[PDB]
Design an enzyme around this catalytic site. Sequence first.
Site, PDB file in Angstrom:
ATOM      1  N   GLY D  13       0.774  -1.230   0.000  1.00  0.00           N
ATOM      2  CA  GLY D  13       0.000   0.000   0.000  1.00  0.00           C
ATOM      3  C   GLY D  13       0.809   1.285   0.000  1.00  0.00           C
ATOM      4  O   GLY D  13       0.411   2.281   0.617  1.00  0.00           O
ATOM      5  N   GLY D  49      11.986  16.983  -1.215  1.00  0.00           N
ATOM      6  CA  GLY D  49      12.041  17.769  -2.440  1.00  0.00           C
ATOM      7  C   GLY D  49      10.741  18.040  -3.183  1.00  0.00           C
ATOM      8  O   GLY D  49      10.150  19.112  -3.048  1.00  0.00           O
ATOM      9  N   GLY D  50      10.299  17.082  -3.988  1.00  0.00           N
ATOM     10  CA  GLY D  50       9.067  17.271  -4.723  1.00  0.00           C
ATOM     11  C   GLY D  50       8.848  16.263  -5.829  1.00  0.00           C
ATOM     12  O   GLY D  50       9.524  15.231  -5.909  1.00  0.00           O
ATOM     13  N   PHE D 141      16.053  21.849  -8.950  1.00  0.00           N
ATOM     14  CA  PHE D 141      16.463  20.616  -8.274  1.00  0.00           C
ATOM     15  C   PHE D 141      17.776  19.996  -8.765  1.00  0.00           C
ATOM     16  O   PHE D 141      18.510  20.589  -9.567  1.00  0.00           O
ATOM     17  CB  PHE D 141      15.342  19.571  -8.338  1.00  0.00           C
ATOM     18  CG  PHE D 141      15.162  18.809  -7.056  1.00  0.00           C
ATOM     19  CD1 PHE D 141      14.974  19.491  -5.854  1.00  0.00           C
ATOM     20  CD2 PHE D 141      15.177  17.418  -7.043  1.00  0.00           C
ATOM     21  CE1 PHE D 141      14.803  18.800  -4.663  1.00  0.00           C
ATOM     22  CE2 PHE D 141      15.006  16.715  -5.852  1.00  0.00           C
ATOM     23  CZ  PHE D 141      14.818  17.410  -4.662  1.00  0.00           C
ATOM     24  N   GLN D 255      21.266   4.039  -5.632  1.00  0.00           N
ATOM     25  CA  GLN D 255      21.584   5.471  -5.571  1.00  0.00           C
ATOM     26  C   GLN D 255      21.842   6.002  -4.163  1.00  0.00           C
ATOM     27  O   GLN D 255      21.114   5.687  -3.221  1.00  0.00           O
ATOM     28  CB  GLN D 255      20.481   6.315  -6.227  1.00  0.00           C
ATOM     29  CG  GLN D 255      20.831   7.807  -6.270  1.00  0.00           C
ATOM     30  CD  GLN D 255      19.784   8.667  -6.961  1.00  0.00           C
ATOM     31  OE1 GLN D 255      18.638   8.760  -6.516  1.00  0.00           O
ATOM     32  NE2 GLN D 255      20.182   9.308  -8.056  1.00  0.00           N
ATOM     33  N   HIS D 257      22.487   9.424  -1.604  1.00  0.00           N
ATOM     34  CA  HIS D 257      22.205  10.854  -1.439  1.00  0.00           C
ATOM     35  C   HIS D 257      23.327  11.497  -0.614  1.00  0.00           C
ATOM     36  O   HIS D 257      23.757  10.961   0.410  1.00  0.00           O
ATOM     37  CB  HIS D 257      20.840  11.052  -0.768  1.00  0.00           C
ATOM     38  CG  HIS D 257      20.368  12.477  -0.735  1.00  0.00           C
ATOM     39  ND1 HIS D 257      20.498  13.282   0.379  1.00  0.00           N
ATOM     40  CD2 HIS D 257      19.739  13.230  -1.668  1.00  0.00           C
ATOM     41  CE1 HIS D 257      19.966  14.466   0.132  1.00  0.00           C
ATOM     42  NE2 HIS D 257      19.498  14.461  -1.103  1.00  0.00           N
ATOM     43  N   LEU D 267      17.009  12.258   6.191  1.00  0.00           N
ATOM     44  CA  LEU D 267      17.145  13.144   5.054  1.00  0.00           C
ATOM     45  C   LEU D 267      17.096  14.626   5.361  1.00  0.00           C
ATOM     46  O   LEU D 267      16.464  15.076   6.317  1.00  0.00           O
ATOM     47  CB  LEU D 267      16.085  12.840   3.991  1.00  0.00           C
ATOM     48  CG  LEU D 267      16.322  13.645   2.705  1.00  0.00           C
ATOM     49  CD1 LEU D 267      17.631  13.189   2.066  1.00  0.00           C
ATOM     50  CD2 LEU D 267      15.172  13.476   1.737  1.00  0.00           C
ATOM     51  N   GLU D 270      17.148  18.345  -1.033  1.00  0.00           N
ATOM     52  CA  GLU D 270      18.037  18.880  -2.075  1.00  0.00           C
ATOM     53  C   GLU D 270      17.544  20.310  -2.367  1.00  0.00           C
ATOM     54  O   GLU D 270      18.234  21.108  -3.034  1.00  0.00           O
ATOM     55  CB  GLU D 270      17.966  18.004  -3.348  1.00  0.00           C
ATOM     56  CG  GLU D 270      19.155  18.141  -4.310  1.00  0.00           C
ATOM     57  CD  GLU D 270      19.476  16.833  -5.062  1.00  0.00           C
ATOM     58  OE1 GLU D 270      20.608  16.742  -5.615  1.00  0.00           O
ATOM     59  OE2 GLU D 270      18.608  15.907  -5.101  1.00  0.00           O
ATOM     60  N   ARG D 301      23.200  12.431  -8.106  1.00  0.00           N
ATOM     61  CA  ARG D 301      23.640  11.827  -6.844  1.00  0.00           C
ATOM     62  C   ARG D 301      25.062  11.276  -7.006  1.00  0.00           C
ATOM     63  O   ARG D 301      26.004  11.786  -6.379  1.00  0.00           O
ATOM     64  CB  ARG D 301      22.696  10.694  -6.434  1.00  0.00           C
ATOM     65  CG  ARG D 301      21.433  11.153  -5.722  1.00  0.00           C
ATOM     66  CD  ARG D 301      20.613  12.106  -6.570  1.00  0.00           C
ATOM     67  NE  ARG D 301      19.374  12.487  -5.902  1.00  0.00           N
ATOM     68  CZ  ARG D 301      18.508  13.373  -6.383  1.00  0.00           C
ATOM     69  NH1 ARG D 301      18.745  13.972  -7.541  1.00  0.00           N
ATOM     70  NH2 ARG D 301      17.404  13.656  -5.705  1.00  0.00           N
ATOM     71  N   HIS D 369      19.956   5.842  -0.397  1.00  0.00           N
ATOM     72  CA  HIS D 369      18.695   6.570  -0.336  1.00  0.00           C
ATOM     73  C   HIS D 369      17.622   6.045  -1.291  1.00  0.00           C
ATOM     74  O   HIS D 369      16.436   6.075  -0.960  1.00  0.00           O
ATOM     75  CB  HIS D 369      19.000   8.065  -0.567  1.00  0.00           C
ATOM     76  CG  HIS D 369      17.841   8.877  -1.060  1.00  0.00           C
ATOM     77  ND1 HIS D 369      16.686   9.054  -0.333  1.00  0.00           N
ATOM     78  CD2 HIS D 369      17.671   9.569  -2.213  1.00  0.00           C
ATOM     79  CE1 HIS D 369      15.853   9.818  -1.018  1.00  0.00           C
ATOM     80  NE2 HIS D 369      16.426  10.143  -2.163  1.00  0.00           N
ATOM     81  N   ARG D 404      18.679   7.586 -11.011  1.00  0.00           N
ATOM     82  CA  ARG D 404      17.382   8.258 -11.010  1.00  0.00           C
ATOM     83  C   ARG D 404      17.628   9.745 -10.893  1.00  0.00           C
ATOM     84  O   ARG D 404      18.628  10.172 -10.310  1.00  0.00           O
ATOM     85  CB  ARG D 404      16.534   7.804  -9.822  1.00  0.00           C
ATOM     86  CG  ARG D 404      15.601   8.883  -9.256  1.00  0.00           C
ATOM     87  CD  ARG D 404      14.879   8.364  -8.021  1.00  0.00           C
ATOM     88  NE  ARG D 404      14.145   9.391  -7.286  1.00  0.00           N
ATOM     89  CZ  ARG D 404      14.708  10.377  -6.591  1.00  0.00           C
ATOM     90  NH1 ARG D 404      16.034  10.504  -6.517  1.00  0.00           N
ATOM     91  NH2 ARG D 404      13.931  11.234  -5.944  1.00  0.00           N
ATOM     92  N   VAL D 410       8.887   9.837  -7.093  1.00  0.00           N
ATOM     93  CA  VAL D 410       7.488  10.052  -6.686  1.00  0.00           C
ATOM     94  C   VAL D 410       6.658  10.727  -7.787  1.00  0.00           C
ATOM     95  O   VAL D 410       5.688  11.448  -7.520  1.00  0.00           O
ATOM     96  CB  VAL D 410       7.353  10.896  -5.374  1.00  0.00           C
ATOM     97  CG1 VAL D 410       8.118  10.226  -4.249  1.00  0.00           C
ATOM     98  CG2 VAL D 410       7.803  12.334  -5.602  1.00  0.00           C
TER      99      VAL D 410
END
Lengths: 254, 254, 239, 655, 55
Positions: D13, D49-50, D141, D255, D257, D267, D270, D301, D369, D404, D410
């Site tokens: 989920g 971040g976003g 970013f 990856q 971070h 975290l 960035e 990264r 990360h 990535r 996301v």
Amino acid sequence: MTNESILESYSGVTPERKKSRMPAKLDWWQSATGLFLGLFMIGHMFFVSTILLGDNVMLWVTKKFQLDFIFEGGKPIVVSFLAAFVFAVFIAHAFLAMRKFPINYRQYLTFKTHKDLMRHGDTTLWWIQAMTGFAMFFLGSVHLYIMMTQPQTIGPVSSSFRMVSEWMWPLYLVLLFAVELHGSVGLYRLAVKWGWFDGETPDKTRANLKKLKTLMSAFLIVLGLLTFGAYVKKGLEQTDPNIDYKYFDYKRTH
Amino acid sequence: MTNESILESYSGVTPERKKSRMPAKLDWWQSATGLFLGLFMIGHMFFVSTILLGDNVMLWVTKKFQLDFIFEGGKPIVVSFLAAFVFAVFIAHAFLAMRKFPINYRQYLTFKTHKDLMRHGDTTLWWIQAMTGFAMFFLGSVHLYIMMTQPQTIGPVSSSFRMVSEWMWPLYLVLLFAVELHGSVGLYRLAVKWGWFDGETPDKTRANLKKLKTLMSAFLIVLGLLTFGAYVKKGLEQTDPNIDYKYFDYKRTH
Amino acid sequence: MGRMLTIRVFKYDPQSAVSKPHFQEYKIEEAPSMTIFIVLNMIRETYDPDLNFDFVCRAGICGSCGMMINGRPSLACRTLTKDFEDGVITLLPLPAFKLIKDLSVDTGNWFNGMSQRVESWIHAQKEHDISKLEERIEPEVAQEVFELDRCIECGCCIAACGTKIMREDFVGAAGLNRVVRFMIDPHDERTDEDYYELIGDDDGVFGCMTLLACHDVCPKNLPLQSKIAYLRRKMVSVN
Amino acid sequence: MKVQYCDSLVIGGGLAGLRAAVATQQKGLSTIVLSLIPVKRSHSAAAQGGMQASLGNSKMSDGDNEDLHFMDTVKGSDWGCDQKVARMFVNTAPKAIRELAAWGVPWTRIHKGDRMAIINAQKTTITEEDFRHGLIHSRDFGGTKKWRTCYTADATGHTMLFAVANECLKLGVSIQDRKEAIALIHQDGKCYGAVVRDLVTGDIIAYVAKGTLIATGGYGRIYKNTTNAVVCEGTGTAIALETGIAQLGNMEAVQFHPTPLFPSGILLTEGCRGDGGILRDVDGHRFMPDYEPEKKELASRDVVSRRMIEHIRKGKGVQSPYGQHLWLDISILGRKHIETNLRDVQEICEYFAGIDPAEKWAPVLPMQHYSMGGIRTDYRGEAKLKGLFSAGEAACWDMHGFNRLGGNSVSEAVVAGMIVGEYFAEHCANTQVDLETKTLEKFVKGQEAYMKSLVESKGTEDVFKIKNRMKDVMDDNVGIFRDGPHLEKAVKELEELYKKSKNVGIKNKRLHANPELEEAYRVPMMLKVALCVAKGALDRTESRGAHNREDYPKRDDINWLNRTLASWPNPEQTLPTLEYEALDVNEMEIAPGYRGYGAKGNYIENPLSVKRQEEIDKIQSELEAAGKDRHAIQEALMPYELPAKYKARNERLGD
Amino acid sequence: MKVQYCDSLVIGGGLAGLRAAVATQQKGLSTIVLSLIPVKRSHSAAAQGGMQASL
Ligand SMILES: *Cc1cc2c(cc1C)nc1c(=O)[nH]c(=O)nc-1n2C[C@H](O)[C@H](O)[C@H](O)COP(=O)(O)OP(=O)(O)OC[C@H]1O[C@@H](n2cnc3c(N)ncnc32)[C@H](O)[C@@H]1O
Ligand SMILES: *Cc1cc2c(cc1C)nc1c(=O)[nH]c(=O)nc-1n2C[C@H](O)[C@H](O)[C@H](O)COP(=O)(O)OP(=O)(O)OC[C@H]1O[C@@H](n2cnc3c(N)ncnc32)[C@H](O)[C@@H]1O
Ligand code: HEM
Ligand code: HEM
Ligand code: HEM
Ligand code: HEM
Ligand SMILES: CCCCCCCCCCCCO[C@@H]1O[C@H](CO)[C@@H](O[C@H]2O[C@H](CO)[C@@H](O)[C@H](O)[C@H]2O)[C@H](O)[C@H]1O
Ligand SMILES: CCCCCCCCCCCCO[C@@H]1O[C@H](CO)[C@@H](O[C@H]2O[C@H](CO)[C@@H](O)[C@H](O)[C@H]2O)[C@H](O)[C@H]1O
Ligand code: SF4
Ligand code: F3S
Ligand code: FES
Ligand code: NA
């Protein structure tokens, strides 16, 4: 708070894993304290209905309550101890019996409707217990405090005074019916709740306990009103501005 | 009962299928009636704290309450109407605010424990409101009835009488703190419940409303005790057995 | 750092007929920057691996790790031992939540349930073309409609609400809050009486006795204080 | 036997797992959704971040489009990704972000007026026009030459996860937290569902259903120092591998971070840098356009991190009782640009680091990360075990390759959920299955036995010592800089442990709500997923993207333009069976070259690379002279396939 | 589509239907028992005379 207080609260079971016995110890005193007041109120209806027997006979009993035959001719602070006491077992009862109260818009609205649709005797007589019970929250408090602050003002003349000169008859008239319905039913419902009389035909017992309730409290409602009109008349005929009737002393006061 | 009474009871929704508005009309009067008594109790703390200003200044205000400047030199039955009234808005409040009461072994035990573990100011001050609230069920009733049955016995001399000669100081001392905590917090909690003051930083408002509560009720707890010791002293110095102080008349009585 | 710590923990397993509500003391030596997440964990990996407890993000944004630390509901993963004066730390599972074991309770499904109760989701009447463009909102509206979407469904304002601990159908602060978060969102076309049908009963906003315990313990610092009050001012004048 | 059916299961989920279940439940398919912990507490919530979408509203997102995003993505992938997927994606993110915003999600939007940007150097005063007021805003970013990273403060992932999960609840989806999948059910290479163990009651249930999707998120926890939540253990990756039919892809592509608050690993966005904040060395300056002039920060990264270990290995690591590290100074980035939009990444610093952000620099240090690899699937989502789909950090749909791009994961979550969703609904609604009681029983009665052995186990291994030892091995030898000898002392101990993990002994015998028993059947899986990465990396002899091999530093295009497809065919074997899959240069809309940054000219070039390039520019220029739009040419160079619902092109600001 | 599985269904919570479900459920078989109206209201309840057993 204790550790077994936290535990019983956070789990809902005693530290030894059992349902608290409390609810039983509590359901015992609600009935317990209730029975007490129930009888004191019949005895009080006699220790007081003696005013229909000369100001003298009544004036007599008021003294003995003061242990005159031990402490001089009278001792008022002794009555303040019966009031101060029967005032504690008054509060305790209220506090434990108000749990059985309707309490939020729904529990009230629902119960009501049901009562009216059903039209069930015993279910309707409860309501009355729960009604009068509230009322006595206000009325009964005045009276009880007094017999604890002015235990000397109680006699055949001084008591008549309070009745009309201080205005208690407006009250003693209301409270007179409450304490007599709440007491009456309370006892009938108490006899069937624990059913000490059930027997071999508990269906016939609940039958008499229901009719006996009546006569016994119909007799106390008349006798109670007679004893009422007595101090009222005795209170009207007190126009001598040169006398403190409230403190109408005889010897060890009055 | 009505048909929409049955319906709203058997379905839980108004005949037009909506949740009864009642619970809102009710949550309004609990706060409503509560606010009233809250202020009358500050005003009453002044209309009464005038005994620290000559028996004359105080004796003055007691008259005007009787509309002397309209009805002769004094009218006591007018005060019985303020009591009889502020006695009705006393009951109404209790009846609507006792719904917010703990009520059965569990709701009590659980809440308690929590209160102690948490040690949360505002959550602990509620308890107090719910405590004092019960107490005033008994105490406040006596006093209120009186100012409704003997509205003439209120003056600088006659009131002092009641205080010690009839013994109210044992009571006025207890009730004096209840009605002042329950009133104080009640108002603070009332200001944050509906938050009329919130503003653009409701976090700073709740901050002052919380400290202001104090000073305002710390001032009324001292001034209240001063006004207390006043009728007490005035009540001690009344040894003339040849005077009815309770009815220490001047003109239109006393 | 190096000082001894006394850890009092609650324990009981509702599904084991032989388990009894008791405490358990563990003794951990302090470390610098030691959060209960560590302490409670050492206790597992080393001392006792029977202890149940829920951790997820460890950063303080998932809302899982919520419990009664020295009488106050708060986030474990963001609570330091340093701040505990004398050194005794008692751990209790959040009250007013279906217990599971020791410190593990069901925070989830009550919220996944209260969410449903207050119909927690944009109530638009028609969809916008995800292909075409977007709905323009004042950058300052979408601002406040944020501070209330921040609720992380942790449970603390349900655990502190003395009310919800007595009457248990109460919606809880975290619930009333949600309702507002949607009143004030433009995309949602719900009216005031629509909300009165969700929380205009003695189990809703009205059952709130403004104890303000929620507002003071919210690990994310929301305006439950005024907001719950604001809600009240409307629902009470409704119809 | 306890069995529960549904038209379409959804193991996980998360953020992606939920979106998917929305596109199925919305069309009649009765669906379920298993999950370790209640959904809204997934790891997605912790997104800083976003979300990146080729939107183009902000004065900076301006002129942005699929193509640019496409390239930005592909060049970042260090060419090890599937171009037509990265393509499906970009053309969907935009309409994905819009859907969200319409579901509630409050995206910090643009305001009429002059701003106060920081850029690299300093304050520059940007000015948004007025036909932009009220539109989804953006942030600069990592590695983007355009501002297309959208946000709702710095707790973006949060407002999304909720907006979605809330939607499921509106549709009647069925969430069933505290329920874990521990084995998939296949018969003749087809997935019928899964075997679940109610974490609470402790009993095994068989969850059968036509389709079955796995979205179990990254596997960052196989490492000691990771930013991933404690429930990102890759068990879900592990069970698809245990069927021995499906394969995991680029398991060795992990990856890292650059600025995770050291040592906790919590975290620190960035947006720190994309908002102007910059990295201070040990001397305290800017090894920034010092090591790489196009800004060290605002580089991928694998880039921004690499040297963060170089400065330290030159002994310049100004440690503490835990290790050397650096600092991030955003003290100069305003106290409004910090007390907001870097709101969490400020509280995070006070409650843990015990200091203030708009004051100082933080004790950071690169750590794991993200997890590119995972269950390898085709372009439509399905894997080799026909019937089993996948999406989210969990799997390898591979629009990522070996790196990535910040703000893509996301976006892939919701996007992939939208796409792979339509293809999952299709499968479940059509494919017909032959459910056999003998088989169902075989798996269930077979899992129950497994649990028992574990309880009656008499071995004497502390699973907590084996578990913790694994995380040590990984974080050490399979760190940012890997080398032949160390990816051997590893692939070895990791194996020697999967053999010890079968001789563990638990103290708590109870078969319910047992946490210890959980770490007992969970560990063995992690190790097998660990062997896939360590060995997967050991084999891949070259340096591509996040895979830095100190001994094969050149991005080999002639030998390694493939994907490490790891499988585990037999139950006994102790090492994954790595097979490789080659990439077709004549399908790439962009041929293998310099990535726009990173170390220049460090890739052993392949011949077809160039040839393809030429004929790209051929076609290019010809159809430009012909007067063809960028979609017509795109169509030329390389066509990609999409589902009906998401075909239309994303209408932008000013056309 | 809504589907529910069980090791052994039992269409009819009568007097017989229930006994049967007892001998199955008592040995691991997860069973269900459908019924028009709650079981204890079946038609068996209305049995007058008695049960005959060669006792
Ligand atoms: C860890 C992290 C990740 C992250 C980030 C910051 C941190 C600290 N910041 C990001 C950012 O700023 N921008 C971005 O684009 N991505 C960022 N990320 C990573 C991103 O959030 C993830 O890649 C993405 O959310 C992954 O997809 P998904 O939402 O599906 O997965 P998840 O959140 O990891 O959750 C996994 C779910 O599956 C359930 N689960 C796991 N195993 C099982 C088993 N065996 N059985 C049943 N259910 C299972 C989990 O409980 C969970 O719900
Ligand atoms: C009617 C009657 C029967 C009777 C009797 C007196 C009367 C008025 N007196 C008896 C007596 O003294 N001695 C005796 O031995 N038998 C007597 N009987 C008959 C006896 O009770 C019946 O023969 C016996 O009970 C029948 O077995 P069973 O208990 O299984 O069946 P039932 O009671 O009729 O109940 C039927 C159940 O099935 C459910 N049902 C029916 N159709 C469906 C469908 N389509 N789907 C799902 N469930 C279904 C019914 O709801 C019920 O539970
Ligand atoms: C003003 C305070 C009082 C309150 C609040 C009150 C309230 C109640 C209520 C609601 C019950 C419980 C009904 C039940 O649960 O079955 C009850 C019963 C009863 N009360 Fe009172 N009461 C009050 C005063 C009195 C007094 C003064 C008497 C004296 C005649 C009295 C005698 C009884 C009796 C006999 C019972 C039966 C208790 C039982 O059912 O076990 N009460 N009362
Ligand atoms: C120890 C305390 C009590 C004593 C000694 C006491 C004494 C008296 C006396 C002497 C009177 C006459 C009027 C007067 O002098 O004021 C009276 C009347 C009355 N008392 Fe009490 N009482 C006590 C407790 C109670 C209680 C608890 C109740 C019940 C709530 C009660 C209810 C009444 C009522 C209604 C009357 C009216 C009698 C009538 O007119 O029939 N009393 N009481
Ligand atoms: C003896 C009867 C009384 C009872 C049973 C009682 C009970 C209560 C209780 C339990 C509350 C409700 C707390 C809540 O739900 O938030 C409350 C509040 C309050 N009461 Fe009383 N009270 C009594 C008398 C008084 C009096 C004499 C005053 C006068 C100073 C007063 C003033 C208030 C105020 C200001 C509030 C706030 C109401 C609100 O929260 O909206 N109360 N009372
Ligand atoms: C309309 C009715 C009321 C009037 C006119 C009134 C009048 C008075 C007066 C004149 C006194 C002095 C003592 C005496 O003469 O007996 C007094 C004292 C007192 N009253 Fe009231 N009162 C009223 C309502 C209330 C209410 C409802 C409360 C709150 C429950 C209250 C609480 C007190 C207390 C505790 C004192 C003590 C004052 C002190 O010593 O500081 N009164 N009242
Ligand atoms: C028997 C009393 C029990 C002890 C007291 C506490 C429990 C019962 C009250 C709690 C429930 C509140 O109940 C609610 O009270 C308000 C009083 O303002 C009633 O209001 C109604 O009756 C009152 C009294 O006759 C009228 O003056 C009023 O105009 C009418 O609308 C509501 O119909 C009732 O539902
Ligand atoms: C704040 C009061 C609220 C209004 C009143 C109604 C609600 C609260 C009471 C209902 C619950 C009954 O609560 C129960 O009462 C009995 C009193 O006999 C308490 O009994 C305990 O306290 C009382 C009073 O200090 C002691 O005399 C007694 O020895 C002790 O055992 C129980 O610990 C309590 O749990
Ligand atoms: S509203 Fe506050 S206390 Fe309640 S769950 Fe959300 S963040 Fe926690
Ligand atoms: S503390 Fe609880 S009682 Fe209401 S005011 Fe807040 S939700
Ligand atoms: S452990 Fe995740 S928020 Fe506390
Ligand atoms: Na991935």
